[PDB]
Symmetry: D2
Subunit: 457 residues, 4 copies
Amino acid sequence: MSPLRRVLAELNRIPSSRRRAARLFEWLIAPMPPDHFYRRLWEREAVLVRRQDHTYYQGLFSTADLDSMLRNEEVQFGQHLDAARYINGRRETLNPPGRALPAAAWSLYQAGCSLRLLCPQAFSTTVWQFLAVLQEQFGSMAGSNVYLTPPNSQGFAPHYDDIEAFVLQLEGRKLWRVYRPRAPTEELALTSSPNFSQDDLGEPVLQTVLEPGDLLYFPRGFIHQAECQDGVHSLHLTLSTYQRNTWGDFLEAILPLAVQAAMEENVEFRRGLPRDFMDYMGAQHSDSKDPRRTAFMEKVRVLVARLGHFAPVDAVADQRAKDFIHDSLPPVLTDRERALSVYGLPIRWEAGEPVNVAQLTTETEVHMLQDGIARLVGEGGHLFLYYTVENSRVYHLEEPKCLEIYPQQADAMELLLGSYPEFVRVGDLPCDSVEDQLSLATTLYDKGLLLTKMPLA
Amino acid sequence: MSPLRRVLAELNRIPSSRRRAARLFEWLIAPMPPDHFYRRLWEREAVLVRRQDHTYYQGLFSTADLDSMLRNEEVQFGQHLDAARYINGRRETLNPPGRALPAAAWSLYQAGCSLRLLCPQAFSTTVWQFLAVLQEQFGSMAGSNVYLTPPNSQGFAPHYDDIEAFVLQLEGRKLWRVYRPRAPTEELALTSSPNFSQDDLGEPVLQTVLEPGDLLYFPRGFIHQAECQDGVHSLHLTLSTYQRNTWGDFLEAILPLAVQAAMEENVEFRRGLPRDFMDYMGAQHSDSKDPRRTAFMEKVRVLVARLGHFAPVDAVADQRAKDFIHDSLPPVLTDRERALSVYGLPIRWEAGEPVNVGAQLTTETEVHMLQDGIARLVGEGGHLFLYYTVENSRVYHLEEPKCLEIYPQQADAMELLLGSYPEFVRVGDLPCDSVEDQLSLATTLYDKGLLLTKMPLA
Amino acid sequence: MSPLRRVLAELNRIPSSRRRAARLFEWLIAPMPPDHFYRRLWEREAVLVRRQDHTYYQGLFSTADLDSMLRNEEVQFGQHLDAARYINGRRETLNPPGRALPAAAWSLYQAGCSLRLLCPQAFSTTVWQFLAVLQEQFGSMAGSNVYLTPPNSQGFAPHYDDIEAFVLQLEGRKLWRVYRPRAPTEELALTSSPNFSQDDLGEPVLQTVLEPGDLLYFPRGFIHQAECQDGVHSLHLTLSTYQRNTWGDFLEAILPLAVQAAMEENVEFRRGLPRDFMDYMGAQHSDSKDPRRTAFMEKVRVLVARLGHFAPVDAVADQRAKDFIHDSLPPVLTDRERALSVYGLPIRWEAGEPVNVGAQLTTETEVHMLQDGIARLVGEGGHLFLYYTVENSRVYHLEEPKCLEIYPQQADAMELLLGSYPEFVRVGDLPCDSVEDQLSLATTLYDKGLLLTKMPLA
Amino acid sequence: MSPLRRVLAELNRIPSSRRRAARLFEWLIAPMPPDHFYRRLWEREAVLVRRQDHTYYQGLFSTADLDSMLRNEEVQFGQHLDAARYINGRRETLNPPGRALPAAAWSLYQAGCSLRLLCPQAFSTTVWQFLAVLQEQFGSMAGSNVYLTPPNSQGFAPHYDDIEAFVLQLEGRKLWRVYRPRAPTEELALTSSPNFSQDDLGEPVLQTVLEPGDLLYFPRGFIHQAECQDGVHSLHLTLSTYQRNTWGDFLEAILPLAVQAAMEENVEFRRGLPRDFMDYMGAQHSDSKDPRRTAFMEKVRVLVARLGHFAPVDAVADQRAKDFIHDSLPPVLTDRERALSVYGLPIRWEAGEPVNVGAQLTTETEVHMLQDGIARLVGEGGHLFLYYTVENSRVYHLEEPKCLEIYPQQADAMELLLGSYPEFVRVGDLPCDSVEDQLSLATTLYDKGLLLTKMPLA
């Protein structure tokens, strides 16, 4: 048995979804320790992990699974699969219209075209499981792409991305070349770059041949390019995360709300501008010596600084959590979680008709299904519980899902969300009455958000 | 002549539009000094000026003009004119559909309805000049509304506005009650309030009967209400300005551009947020004692404070200047300005042919801007544009923004012209790298009605 | 006094607007009888009328009026004025952006450009009356353009239009070449053609030099071109009408309504199509002889023929009338019509207050519609609405469709008034089931300016 | 092996898709002959078929399949599944938001609510094959719904539909009540009716209990209602077709295009309307005796009738076929079609490299269209296009319309293939003036999965 199915089997025996996420990441970069990685390497340097084990990722994804997908599923060119080549320093795209049947795909492959699968998780349960778990410890959507390159070729031109990449060599070997950010403004880039030329590139800060099992990491801003060696093809999966998840993004949402609050709460933000600032402010006056200009600029600077006092940091943090819930992949349940949830509730048929399949009582111990599937949020004064359980495996196919939380249950809801994975008697929930104590537990159980100590039926 | 006619005749002999604007405002609040007014009263107190001269505004606007325009102009109920009355503590609008003919308007007036004309500057050249000149010293659009109230009646319910108001009593008399901001959040209000009841009101900070010639000023946020007492009717013009022209409005436009620039120019703004901040940030974690929450909060305040360094203050001032130019009323030219510009060119059709057709400026022609507040140089998308007011309609926003592109090789000369008004400068002395660039810029500006010459062209 | 001024003074004398319209049109083509014109020439032949009177149109429009307009009005290039020239077989458009000042317009003129004023009626009261009166006998919108061409030049390339044209030569002379429709599909063309080269044209069916006073008419579809000869410039006004006012345009509106009524009222239109008609219908079967195609085609012919039974002809004529009312120029009232309607109602002022107010009609008052083509009763959504032109702008579509609801109880009276103009009818004699309904309808119409009385109310 | 599995296997053996459709429909209404059904019952009468065999449908759909769907599929409430109950003369809808898990669905069931699955063909491979074959002989989209009703209850209120319905009893019994059209306008209704009250209903034309295997058909416009009586639940599948596929619908598309062609092709439809038709046409002239009114109406009648001559029947037929291709369910290939098509080309990754790849066609290969109802040639904007259904989703309109351009050098050959089905043709026998375009088209078609070869290329 490969280390991968062996860790997956282990994962099925780990109760805490949070701990599972930590465990899988640990596995992903073994033997390097997580704390060292996140504190010194993350968003700072390209890292390589030679695992001396060609069977490490075995079971995650193979060229055979790709072939099986194109044949079994409705794979579409462009939307799901791309065909590209990089010859004579030029990037080419031979994407045919419509479905990508095996016959067309392999014909392009033979023609030296690389094949790129955009959303493996939408078609592979293993890949879905992998990403679904890792997203919980990234605190950001974790996506993926699969790349298959023919012998003696290069599918894509050199460039850097707007996300943190994790390259998992799955089959064959390939020569990688990773460069350190060329200039200060490219460090931790916000957007993807245009295809670069070999001349515009400097000296590789890292150049090696990856083999099955190896892991290659590098933050956004680092240019990279790879090519297959002679007579051997390459297949690898790239895990990506942290797209537009910066302090700047956080501020972009904070500021508008801050100025509005400042104007409503403090009269100094409501006072009129001078009647003649147009005489010394503006491009025409960029070289003015009018002392009023200096005073004007100093006032803008202080007012801007004073905005931090009016910044609804918690609200914006909740809004980002909400969006994260929407971007999240649906959860992967363990045998236990499923068996102890509505998803494992059996249905008994008596005389052809379903005979009461089961019901929650005040003597039932429960706790959230998993740790990263729901988030309480305030909007318009009311509370709403946003969750991932109904999300599709395909990015944003489903709209935000939520269920309103009434004030007489707000505390009980926070407890459950904050006490995971501690079993709490439903009768011990902090509510007004027993009714609100059981209606909450039932609603949450029915949606598949809560699990019980022992099966109800 | 009346004081108004005299001051207008005076303005026609003042060469600088900037000086004309200062003089008219001086006249508006006389004998009170503008310095004192803006330093202590503007946006702070309600002010009353007892003129002791019922003829002060003679010539500005009268009931006779209102009657005249209803008959000779296409005044529409609801777009141009409102008919309202306040009765039993309730506000009611009786605006019939369509055109407001004399009979329809006057019969409402006789029924106790007050008449409100929304844009008098669109139909009165005197009000137009009055506002066009004053806008230049407010640095903000100056609008107006005329109110005609019949005897023993009140047209509107108590309420406060979102603009600075100057009330000019033209005819009759009226009892005014102005109240201070009720609560701190209503001081210098951002939006107009809903109608209030006599119950919602406390005690007037100012209660007086206005007489012709008098002036009453009060900032946005101050509640007001007026009624005609037994005997005479009332007619007044309310000059308004400073709608959404606050420090907060300037910041609103500056913030998005500053964060974007910070992210593009400094890595600290591009760094990733923590992977687990959702564990201590949020409404559900407000009381958390996690020391990371303290650190998070501090980082936000530090980054926000640093944004000031990236705020494109000049670009935002120009965008606001551009918007002001779009909201502006077209200029009112003195006799001299018109005679020295393309508008006063003698070219005309005589004997089946255009005559007076040989006038064209040269490098020896001395020029300068037509007026001081009619154009603004604005940079947008790596290009330079000159926005102007000369083609604006007397009707608010009827016309779209008007501009002409200024090529790089002529920018310094354009700025010199905008900055040295009203000093005459010879075309040959404009700072361009070519003689033809000088001529080209001066000709383009003149033909657009943005430049005048020292002596008429021939 | 010129013929034009003499006929306008005559028109003010004629109590019926229908008759005034008929009179001006006979004047426009005199001495040719309109009966003969509409019977054989209209939409069939180009027509030239040698007036032998150079003063015929004096007072309608002149170059000085154009010059005066550019100076006293806000004429915009593109929107109101086009500058063009046809040089080396190519049409050029030299429109500067912005306002068309005299200096700019005349400079263009001196360079060889023709000037075309798009909406003269919006700036000339005489052209307005001229068109407002003529639109009434055309039963279709009447527009105009003024063309000023400098000596020794051609402003536009030869082409044909989608409207019926009447050319009135106002000043100078000009060589015109009018051609008959090149092909059958070009006779009475649906749209304007692109510019053509001198080689695309055929032989002129009419070639002549127009002099002031002359009239030239030609149907849509007829290619035309004109050039000024040596030493003399040309000025003419082109009156246009009948844009998209054909039987086909009528059918376009009636067909969808007819089909939907047929489907809702006759089961035969609701029957399912064959399950296999796709096997024999379609482009890839157009040469097939399958007897199924023949039966399919037969069914279509029969069903389509029956649609005439379900065609709401009256409702569509009303919709077309309604659109014409929306397209109409506001009416030009005679002195009598103004004095006998609400527009001529005096307002008696006493002690600075209006006391005259508004006069009142009684069951004894004699009345009739202000004019014959200013209103139309239209049924919509189960209700009845009276659409009118009295609040229309002289600028095309500046105003939205105006109407007032007519209640069922006053519909017969409303129809009577529209159908009996200009006969006076006592209010008390209107076909309503109550005195209140008679007074109510007449008062509403009078107040809106749609009705006049036999004697001034006051 | 039930009668259903028997015919399905039988179908897999049948070569032609056209004959498979005919065969399945025959099987669907057995013993009743299709010819009789379509000739006298289709769109004319309600029909009952006592099969006397409760296993006639075994394999099509079951309550266990529904249970499996709710378990192993993302079934959404409202989107895929509905829950309702008709009690006390009122209909209720207790659809909770979110996914429809077994527990919630079954809970509503026991609560007396019926359950309706809206698109079973998207989750059932058998329902998909069933509809995919039947759509081919209807010439219109064939859809379906599944209804699960608990004992002693009724889910839906009585009402009629806008589609032709075929009810297949699958499990249990249910008391059905069908009513003939209440009035003439309701026969072959255009749209679904609202919920009716028992009182709004007359006497059923059919009132019988259905048993597993029975078939109940009734036209759009026929009201119906069904209920379970005692201790027995019911499960049926309703097959619907012919939504908006009437002669009227064909006419709606043809008429606008016909009016335009008539106007461009015949000058009579391009002539101007009379100048004064508004004087005698319109609601206000409904009772006019003017002889011109009669002539106007008679001319409208004839012009409408003549439009049929200009109707593009073939192009509209092609557009409707194009729409049907869009609405069509994807093809359910037979083993032999698969093996002979690009879908059955054995080329799979072996030895770390694609094996057995490269098998192409030659001028000596015999090929015919994969099936008979998956493509349609359409001419648009002067260009030729082939629209197909092979890439359609089982989910209605989830995929946009798909087509490929066919150049002139191969059009004739394409139609040849479209009409030749199901007999083979040598690629060298294509009608093309070059072997290049012969192989080009044959390949383009085989790669898209629209063509099958006589002998497996691999």
